[PDB]
Structure formats: C-alpha cells, structure tokens
Design a protein around this ligand. Structure first.
Ligand SMILES: [Zn+2]
Ligand SMILES: [Zn+2]
Ligand SMILES: [Zn+2]
Lengths: 553, 199, 100, 305, 198, 155
RNA sequence: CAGAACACCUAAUUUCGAAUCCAGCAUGAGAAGC
RNA sequence: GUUAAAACUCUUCUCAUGCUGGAUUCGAAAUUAGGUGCG
C-alpha cells in the first residue's frame, strides 16, 4: 500500500506515498540537486495526486524541498514535522527561493507559496501519537540533524517505520542511539548509506584555516568541536544563515542531547554579521580559524575569503563535508594545504543501520531500501539478507497484516430499546500488538521537572491569574505548546521566563499591584516553577486544571 | 427531446465567501469552535445552493423588464406555471427543465476555508462590544457546477448567462451586504444528445 | 432490481437540514423548513438479477446508470440533490448454484 | 487465514468441509506421498518436505506446516511467511533459525499451556512474534491509556451494538443521545386529553358554515390537508381541535405570519386578515356540532376525510 | 425599477492598518509581525466598509436629532424603522445598500510594508517595548462598488456624508494615532436592473 | 415488583390514565429511571478505575419565565439550550447556567440576552439575577415537570 | 551526500469570541391485464 | 386415514413537484524608532 515516487536517487523529486484507503499519507517529499528537469518534477507532483498529509522527517532539501510545490498544486492538506524542522524549513525555503531567483532558473514555487505552506503547517515533537484518519502517527529521534525524526505510522493494515536519515556516533549535539517504536514494526523503510586531524592542522596553520561546512548540522558540530577543545587562537562564523541556525539550535537546545539540555557553545565564537565585517575578516591577516557555511565553495560568503586563503602558502582548507559533482569545492579537493575529514558525517554507515534494525523489538517483515548510491545499497541489501530479512530495492520492485478487534465477551444477553441491539458491559480494552476487549475476570487473572502538589498548582495559577501574570492568552498558548508535546512547552516556558541581559525584560505579563522588583521577580519564579510542575502532569489533568481559569483551551 | 443543454459553470471567488451550515448535527458540532460555520460536505468540500440564486436573479431581472413572472419568494407562494422561470426552474405542476447542481468546490476545506473574527464596534467609546468567529471561503477558490437543461430553447443559455452576471453583480450567498460573495463566472456549455450513453 | 440499501444507518449518514424560501425583494428569510438528507460519501448497494439474459442488457443497464449519474436519483433533482456515481461488478451465474 | 487445520486460499485442510486434505505423520482429494518430496503440485503451489512439511505458496502468503520434529529436518530454501509449529525445545529453535528468510509470524499448536508459553517467550527473545490459539467485524468508536503489568490498558464500561454488518463499541454519549431521541419520540405521542370527554366557543349557523368553508376552499386557505388534519384533530376530542386551530391561527410576534395557507387572489392585507379570522371563527363554530354532522360538512370538500 | 451604483475609490494619505481577522493567517504571521494587516489569498488588501459607513451615519444622524438606532451597543437589536435600518439593514429586512470590501488595486508587496513601533518610558526616555506591524503605504488605491437595490433620492447624499465622515475620522484601526486618514472619489450612476438581459 | 418512579404529570386518554415512561426493569423486580443508571455508571467508572439549589414555587417559575420571555431575556434558543444541558444531567445544567450568568470581570458583560424595553441598569441586573434564580430552581425539579413548564414557551 | 551573502539593543503583551427570529404549506390516493 | 389431490392475488407504475440558513454586528482598544557617538 506504499508507492515510492522517485525513490531511487532522490533527484528531480522523491516521495513515499503510503495510501491506506482513507488517507494518502506522504513521507519525505523533497528534491536532491545534481549541480529542464523542473518540468519532470512538475509532472511527478501532479502524478502524486491529493495527499492528505505531508509528514516530514528532517529539514534537509532531500526530504523537505517540494513542500510549497505540493502547496502550489494544492495537493497537501496538512504539513507536520518537529518545530526545529519547521523553522529550519523556513530558513531552507527562503534561501532556496533566493537561490532560484539569483541563478535565474524559473522559480519552482514562490515566497507566498512558502508562507501558505506555513499556513497549514502543524507540528509535534517526538513520542506524540496522533490519531489521523485511523492511522496513529508517532515521531522518534533518528540523530541525523536537530529535529530529525523517524516516522511510525500504525494503519489497520500494518505498522510502517519510515526511518529517514540515521545519525552516526560522531554526531555530538544529539543522542547517538536513534529512538525506535516500542511496538511491532511490520515494514521498515530504511535509507541506505552514501576529528583530531582538524585541530592539529589548525595548529600547523595558525601558529605557523578555512573550513567549508554545511549550515545544518555540520557547521554547528565543527563549532561545538572547537568549543570543547579550547586551544589558543579564536573562531569566527562568517555565515549569515549558519549564524541563524546556530542561534536556533541554542533556542532548540531542549531538542538536543540530554547533557546539552542545561550557554551551550561557552562564548568565544565571534560571528560576522554584515558583509563589511566579512571583508575585514577576509583582509584580516591575523592567525584565526574561520568556520563558515557555503557548501562546496560555489556561492555564499566563503568566497570573500577564498582568494585570500587560496594563494596563502601557510593557510589550509578543511573539507569536513562531501563535495558533489561539478562544484568548485570538488575542483579544489581533487587538485584541478588540502585536507578532507570523513568523521564529520551526519549519515550513518552500514553497521549502524544493522544496529538500527537489530534493536527493533521484532524483526521486520520487509526492509525497503530506498535512497543512497547503488552499490552501497546492493551490499547493504546482501547484509540484510544475511540477517534473514526481506529486501525490496526500488529497481527490483505480500501478505496482509490486519489488526483485528475481537469482542471476547458474551453477546447472548442483548436487548432492544431504539431498534438497537445494545447491551451494557464493563470490561477492559487490552491492546496487544489485535485490540482485545476482555471482561473483569480476565483482569483478575492478570492481577528534570520540579514537582508540586495539585492544590499548590491550583492556588498558584489562581494567584498569578488574579495578579495578571498568567493570562487567558498565556494559558491558551501554553496549552497549544503542551498539546504539541512536553519539550515544546518546556521551550516555550523557558523562553518566556528568560531574562534578556541587554534590557532586563522577561516575556511574562507584568503584575498588577504595588509589588517591588524583588516581589515581581519572586512572582516570575513562582510562575516558572508552577508551570514546569504543570508540564510534569498528565495531559487530561492539565486540561482539567487549565479549563477552570481559561474556559476555552 | 433528442438534445440536452449542458452548461459547465466555473466560479472563481473574488471576495470572501460565506454560506452557513444547514445540517443541525454538523452546525451544533461546530458551534463550540465557530459561531458561523460554512456549509460543508462530508467529503470536506464546500457546497453552495445554486438553483435559488439563479431563480431569484432571473425573477428580479424579468420582473424589472416587465414580463409576467411570478414571485415564489413570498410566503408559501405558488408558481403559476406560465413564466419563463417556471419553464426553466420549475412549477408546482411540472418540474423544471434546468437541473442546477450544488456548487461543489475543487478543493478541500483545509485549503480554502479559514476561520475569521468579526466584531461590533460601539459608536461612542470605539470598543469591542461583541465578538464572533465565523468561517469563510478564501478568494481565488474555484467552484464547479453543471446546469442541465432537458428541453433546450433558444433563450435558455442567454437567461442563465444573464442570471450569472446578476449573481456576479450582487453576490452568490451569505453576507452579501458586508461584501461577501462577490465572485466571477466562466461558462462552457454544450448541447449533448440524450441518447449519448447508449452506444 | 433490488432497493438501494445503504451500508450505514441513520445516525451516520442522515442529517436533518435547514432549507429556506427568501423573498426576492427585501432579501429576508420568508419560509423555513427542516428536511432530512443523506450525506456525501455514503455508499449504497443494489443487486440486479437478469433472468434469460440477452447480449445488450449489461450495456443498457450501464447506460441507464450513466444517465442516473448525469441526472440524479431521488427527489429535489433540480436543486442539486442526488448526484451519484455507480460502480458495476457483473457476474454471469448459473441458476443451479444453490443445488449443491 | 487458518482456523484451529483449515487454511482457506478452496479451504485446503492440512491434516470442516469442501477441502483438499493433506495428511501428516510423526474432502474432494487426498494429497500425500501421489507426490513425493521435492515435487510441486497445483490446486496455490503445494510442495511436501520430509520430517524426521506442507509448503503452500499462495497469492498472498507462503504457509509452512511443519508437523512433528524428531535428527536433522528438511526445510524449504525459498520464502516463508507463516510457520505453523507444534510444541510438546532447542530442536524447534534451530529448525526455525537454520531456515532462510525467517517467517513473519509463527503459530504454536498441540501442547499444554506451560510448554507453549516457555517456547513463546523463547521466540519473542529471538525477535519473532508468536500467536497462541485456543463473524461480524468490530469497531471501536472510543478515544487515554495505561501500562499495568506490561499491558496497555483502558478502564472502559460501555455498550456493544449489533447491526447486520458490524458490531460497534459506544460510550455513554451515544446512549444519552438515543435516550433523548426516544424520550422526545415518547412525549410527542400523547396530548393530555386525546380521545376523552367532550369539552366557550362562537356559534354560527350551518348554512353560513357551508358558505364560509366553500369560499375558503375556492381560494386556497382551507385546503384538503387542512380539512384532513382538522378532522384528525377533531377525532381526538374537542380540546385537541381547540389547540390545533389556536396553533394554526397563531400570529407569531416576531414575524407576523400565521400557519394558514395564503389566499389565491388580489386581496389586500386587511381583507387577508379578515379571511384568516373568518376561517378561525368558521372552524370554531364547526367544532360545536356532532361528529356525524361535521363529517357530512367535510365530506363534500375532502372525500377521504 | 432602478438600482444605484456608487463606484468609490480610496486614496490613502496617512498609513493604513486593518488587522488580519483570519486565525490561520494570523498565527502563520504572528512569528514575523505582531500586527498583520488584512490580506486576501490573492495577495490584495481587504478593508471592511459596511460597518464604518453605518457607524458614520449612525453617529451623525444621532447627533442631528433623528430617531436612529444604535447598533454599536452590545447585542443591540436594530429598530427596522430608521434611515440606517433602511439603508444598511435590520433584523427583519435586509439592507438596500450592499457595500463591498475595499479591494486594493495593488499587491501586498507593492503597498504593504512592515513597520516597527515603540513604547518609551516617560522618565527614562528609553525604548521599553518594541513591536512590528504591517501597514499600507500612502497613495495606495482601493475600490468599492456600493450597490443600492431600491433607491430613494437621499441615499447617495447619505453615502457621501458618511464618506466625508470617514475622511474626517478614518478607516481601519489605530485611528487615534493618526492611521487611516484617507480620501474618497465618488462616481454615481443609476442602472436598470434588467440591463444584463439579452 | 415495585415502581421506583413517582407517577406525576399523568395524562387522561379516555378511561386510561396514562404516562409515557422510559426506564429500566431491574430484576433485583424494580423499575428505576435513568438517574439510577448514571449513579450506577459513574459507580463502575470510579470502581473499575480503582481496580487498575434554591427553592421557587411552581407558580413563581412559570410567571418569571413568562415575564422574561416577554422581554426576551429567556429566548427560544436559550430555553432549548437549557433543555439540552438539563437532559445531560443536573451538574451540566448548573455549569451552563453559571457560565451564562457569569459577569466577565474584563468586559462587564453577561451572556444573557439584553432586555427589550426601557429599563434602568439596576433593574437589568435584577432581571439577570431573576433569570439565574428561576432557571437554578428549574434544575431542582425532575425532567417531566421541567418540560411541561418549557413546552409552552419553546414548542 | 548538499544550498549559499560605522555598528548595536529591542520586534513583546492583553481583552472579547457572543446574541436573536423562523422551521411552514399545497397537490395527487387511481387504473388495467391475468 | 379430510367431496381429497394439483395451482404463489401474480404483472404494470421512482413520494414526486414548488422554496437560496437568510437577516442583524468595522479586528479595534493600550504603546513616539527611542537610545548610542563633536564635522
Ligand atoms: Zn539528510
Ligand atoms: Zn409562474
Ligand atoms: Zn434603526
């Protein structure tokens, strides 16, 4: 029941359409660039048809590049990802559209299209199951980039795990072990494969660099690698969108590795903001390390420093990312100092994918290898077959898995009231991996956040509502961020309570009364601790607490 | 007869558009979120009544021209059966030749229907006295219908087109006084044979 | 020809509805009435059994069903009610199938 | 599917009715070793394998019935989807493990509870799911979960409803809705004094009632449905006809309309109101007479009633 | 029977702000601007016009000493007997003057910019609060085609008086800060309501 | 067999005294109404989970409802919604009437329809409290009398 | 294994999301074969 | 072992026609692009 729309090389369009009868759920609607094909992309999106939802795994263009184009032909109803993926998609779509206007290629979608994609853009974080058109959808972290998820869709005809891109051990800002469904996985759609050296050549260039990174993941991991090792010389970020992504991962640090959920980059990262500071740092002859994101030396800011760095016989150029075909970066890496680092790789190797399949609870019925290069997909598929699991490659491309519901109780004692065969029963809806109703005799056969009491939460929210610090708008926004999930509400409450060091203002509503600063700050800390203790509670309990003060949501 | 007239009518919405929900269960399920729901399908599209708008338009213009056209808008009024609109849309004796469809949209509710907020500004004090949220259909939304005339005459396409220009002038449904429902129409008719499907 | 039996019952697919009569001048709701109607997307099932079948019976029945698609089934056909879509699964049958 | 073995797609029986039985060791046709091992038969490609196993390749699913295992067994080298295994312990393990393309779901059969549970736990620790066996489709229309004793649980008490095609599970909101609907239907069945003792009325002659009823029958105020419901409300007593004519003649204060049908003619507003009160007074004088007299009044205008 | 067409054309003289009412377009736009402007899906600018016209005529006719109802009071029932109920509507009768939204002649990117407004402490003289709102530039042209179904002689004069009151006070929001000071051009014509018949 | 329902509102169809009556035949052979069922149902709804008003005279109520219907405080829409909230239980009708009567501290408005007629503000507040007390006393009566009061005003 | 372009500091918050009318009529109740 | 037995009140004909969820309510009410620096 799943169609791989261009799921071989991901160029000129790629998509995973899981049609389940009542829903045309769509996964990984993105574009890969090779660097006239746009018409074939257009024909493929018109070939997709009406999709009820455009699930998004991660914020790269491979999975998120055709979302406003599906909005343009109006084929998608709802677009859901993580909030980190949503704002990184904002930066991606704006930069991609600016690149389409700069290169004079006919624009695929429009800026208004990007906006109207964000009209219908819902968001949830990990481990938040949503019941959409009898499909239960859950997100899990797969350690690729920030906000990157693997999708777990339970339909009545089976459980599908769209893995997306899987992270490696060398990813420092995230947990290494990718989160998995705790239940049965029937079909697993897996995408195949495709540090001290950097520091020591930074010594042999500085005391005697230029680093081309990628703005999502790669530049922030180079920055964090330089943050852990404090050497002697300084680091500069000469990249606008890389600086915005760095600031957002500082904002979205609750979505990161658990150790890094407590600043993060411990200062000392002078970021160049405008192009005049860029020309200054290009003409600066001081020994310093310049990390910046253009990609493969083809367009961006890097090119302000390239000339200065290129002719310099003391400088070096540190390729921490893959260089694709027909790019200036590839033309300088092959030869037509030069160092290439292979540890800075967001994509997992083959053995990490074997680890990913092996720590499933059950062995999947069929592993659908989709993207990656051909020969690596071939050898990976052979190693899946050596683990006795079925493989369907997209070039080569069937039981039926029905999740039945059984009554398991007596139905003889039934009556009629309104031409209905109704009977009252008290039982237990046990849920195996075959929802089962079972009577009470079966049950007898079987049988970071602070913490506050419920009455203290009630009295503190009532006090701060009378003091006007907590508001109906505040409770409504907190309920929206809490229905998003716990971590999004943690980020919202931390963002409200955080005191701006330049101005001394918190985003809390000011108290109404004759309170002196100290009392105002103690009331703000009371609101912070009270709503974190509310965050620790259950969702229905939070709804029953917040419906007293704000009658709607 | 041996020929039938098919008028494919395409509507592009130019102003905001509202047509209120008529199903009591769906309206009562929507009053916990919006005070004015849009008349919507169970397949999540938007339908607009279209026969009454065309009949009202044609009756107003033909009464203005001076023709002997009845007013079936008065309370429990009966059509006489001799008017041109009685021949087209219907009478109590015989059914009408024109079979007007609902205006089903080409897009689903999550793509064309938005939830908006209207107020009641007090004349002095300039404050929000009342505030109500209502659903509406955006501008640029495309609706489709097929008007099916069983026994075509020479003046059936012309009167339908004149009624469509009157609906463009005055609005199709809902809050026509506040500026809602100002739309535009494309017409592609074709006289099809009645025995077409037999083959 | 069998009656068109719906698969769902009245609480799923039948909703009562408000219909109006509006004065042509003064644009005000003059008459109001409630009418039940069947929702969109509801499915109905019929079984047409043709004894002594000729060659053209499937073609004529399918053409009649296309005519019902174009015109409509039920009442209020001029107002847009009853526009449906048919799907036909024909099956040639020996009459002696029950005689096992 | 397999019912505890009958495996439809047919209804082939492996070791009931309308079947192609395949006996094991250790209907319309009986297939056994004629076809020996390593040879395939059609019916759904069926191949038998020696035990010291029936292999049906269908359109959807490749089913394997093992039989009793004693010694190295013999297993197919193709693709297995279901593995029906007896359990009455390490021999079954490697019989599973040494087979390529390990099956989707295995089935345990022909044993007690403890041995089947121990083997089942050993197969979940091998990461292969098990099923332990011991019709209208059922629909949960419910919506909170729990995790007591490693089961996902929900405390729910509700109703089961049984239609001709499905069985649904509903909560108290459905029962409240149908109870309110049936209470509204029950209370709309009675009025307090229907068909009871005969109950402050204007009086008018029979000829004037004939003249007024004929005049309001020519123009469309007193019509055939009006006379029909008037006679039906007169049959259930005098006060019921009083209530019916007061409901019909009632002018709404918000709209200024009554439930009479408007006259067909060129009458102005005052004359239309005079005709409405003429109809009210004429029918009020008509409720005075006896039932046979009113029937002789109204048969000349509505022959049904 | 005749009908009256009043083609009005607004030129904006002081910057215009009408807030966006659509909840989706609001929450999509409340991460970039704190005060979105009312916008079509076809990227034009929307202004309500019937309420401002009715408010202008209600305030002025109440000041003149006429027996007009105040429909601005909360849950106020219009009388159905006054001039404003005849023109704009009552609970029994609909209004004769069908008044359209003020569709701008230009797209958002040509007439709509994003301004930043402040809130400054009176003692400190420092910018305490900052926010951003969308506003319509000056010289932007809006249009409407006010249609009167059953016209009398005085309705065009009342519409022009209401338009002069809108030029006095303002349309849209933020009127006390100086927003919405506009100018109107009126072209009036009586049209037969049988004129599309051919 | 013992009926657990008081036999009021008891209509007169010929020589057959009558009541339309919906309920349950419990064979414990008792015949209780829906209220016993809800007190039963919530019983299991707290048990199985564990295992894992003012007074007004009936003349005063109909007089007050007639007076508020004439000044359109108690509309047909309001009587209908109060009837649907009263059919869901006493607590739901209590919460709905408390929601309707609640003076919002910001706007200063109540959810009642304003009175039709020239009234002073104090008298308008008295009429709002009269509507609150009258419908609050209507929650106290059983369902069959609260429909026989409200059938005259919203048929 | 992918987008990329004189200086700051700020770009937050709140309140409303309700009320009312209407839910009626009219016509047809028969033929014919076996 | 019943003035028994044998024989189907069967066929033909769409609850259809006439009626627009319409009318009444402005997303506006609060807040200076301020500070910083020598033509
Ligand atoms: Zn990626
Ligand atoms: Zn006529
Ligand atoms: Zn008035």
């Amino acid at each position: 029941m799943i169609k791989f729309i261009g799921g071989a090389s991901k160029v000129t369009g790629s998509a995973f359409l899981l049609e389940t009868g009542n829903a045309k759920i769509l996964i990984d609607c993105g574009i890969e660039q090779e660097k006239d094909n746009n018409e074939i992309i257009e024909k493929k999106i018109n070939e997709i048809g009406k999709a009820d939802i455009c699930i998004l795994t991660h914020a790269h263009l491979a999975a998120s590049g055709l979302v406003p184009l599906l909005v343009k032909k109006r084929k998608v109803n709802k677009i859901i990802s993580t909030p980190a993926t949503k704002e990184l998609c904002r930066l991606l779509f704006n930069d991609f559209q600016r690149i389409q206007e700069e290169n004079n290629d006919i624009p695929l979608y429009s800026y208004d299209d990007i906006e109207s994609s964000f009209e219908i853009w819902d968001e949830i974080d990990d481990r938040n199951t949503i019941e959409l058109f009898d499909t239960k959808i859950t997100f899990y972290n797969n350690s690729h980039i920030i906000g990157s998820v693997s999708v777990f869709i339970e339909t009545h005809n089976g459980n599908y795990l769209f893995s997306g891109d899987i992270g490696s051990k060398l990813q420092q800002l995230m947990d290494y072990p990718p989160d998995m469904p705790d239940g049965n996985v029937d079909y697993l759609i897996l995408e195949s494969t495709y540090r001290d050296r950097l520091l020591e050549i930074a010594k042999t260039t500085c005391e005697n660099v230029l680093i081309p990174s990628f703005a999502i993941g790669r530049l922030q991991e180079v920055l964090y690698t330089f943050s852990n090792y404090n050497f002697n010389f300084p680091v500069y970020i000469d990249s606008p969108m890389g600086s915005k992504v760095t600031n957002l991962i500082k904002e979205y640090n609750i979505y990161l590795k658990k150790k890094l959920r407590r600043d993060l980059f411990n200062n000392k990262y002078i970021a160049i903001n405008t192009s005049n500071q860029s020309k200054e740092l290009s003409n600066s002859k001081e020994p310093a390390v310049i990390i910046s994101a253009s990609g493969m030396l083809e367009g961006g800011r890097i090119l302000n420093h390239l000339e200065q760095i290129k002719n310099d016989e003391n400088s070096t150029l540190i390729f921490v990312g893959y260089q694709a075909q027909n790019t200036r970066g590839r033309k300088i890496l092959d030869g037509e100092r030069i160092e290439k680092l292979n540890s800075f790789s967001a994509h997992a190797d083959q053995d990490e994918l074997i680890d990913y399949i092996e720590r499933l609870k059950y062995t999947p019925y069929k592993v659908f290898l989709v993207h990656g290069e051909k020969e690596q997909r071939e050898i990976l598929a052979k190693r899946i077959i050596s683990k006795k699991i079925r493989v369907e490659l997209p070039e080569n491309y069937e039981i039926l898995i029905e999740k039945k519901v059984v009554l398991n109780i007596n139905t003889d004692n039934m009556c009629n009231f309104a031409s209905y065969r109704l009977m009252p029963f008290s039982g237990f809806i046990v849920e195996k991996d075959r929802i089962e109703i079972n009577d009470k005799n079966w049950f007898d056969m079987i049988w970071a956040l602070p913490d506050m009491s419920h009455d203290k939460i009630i009295e503190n929210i009532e006090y701060l509502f009378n003091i006007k610090i907590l508001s109906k708008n505040r409770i409504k926004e907190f309920w929206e961020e809490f229905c998003k999930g716990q971590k999004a509400a943690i980020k919202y409450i931390t963002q409200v309570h955080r005191k701006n060091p330049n101005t001394g203002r918190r985003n809390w509503n000011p108290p109404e009364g004759d309170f002196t600063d100290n009392e105002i700050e103690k009331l703000y800390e009371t609101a912070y601790n009270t709503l974190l203790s509310l965050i620790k509670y259950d969702k229905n309990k939070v709804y029953n607490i917040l419906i007293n003060f704000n009658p709607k949501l | 007869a041996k020929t039938m007239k098919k008028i494919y009518v395409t509507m592009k919405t130019l102003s905001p558009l509202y047509t209120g929900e008529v199903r009591r269960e769906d309206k009562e399920a929507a009053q916990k979120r919006v005070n004015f729901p849009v008349r919507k399908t169970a397949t999540n599209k938007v339908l607009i009544p279209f026969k009454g708008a065309l009949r009202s338009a044609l009756e107003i213009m033909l009464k203005a021209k001076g023709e002997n056209v009845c007013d079936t808008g008065e309370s429990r009024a009966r059509p006489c059966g001799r008017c041109v609109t009685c021949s087209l849309f219907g009478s109590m004796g015989r059914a009408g030749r024109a079979s007007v469809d609902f205006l089903i949209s080409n897009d689903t509710k999550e793509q064309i229907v938005r939830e908006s907020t209207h107020l009641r500004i007090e004349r002095q004090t300039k404050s929000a006295s009342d505030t109500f949220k209502g659903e509406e259909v955006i501008e640029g939304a495309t609706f489709t219908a097929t008007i099916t005339i069983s026994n075509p005459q020479e003046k059936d396409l012309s009167l339908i087109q004149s009624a469509l220009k009157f609906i463009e002038e005055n609005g199709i449904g809902g809050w026509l006084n506040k500026g809602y429902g100002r739309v535009s129409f494309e017409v592609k008719s074709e006289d099809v044979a009645t025995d077409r499907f037999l083959k």
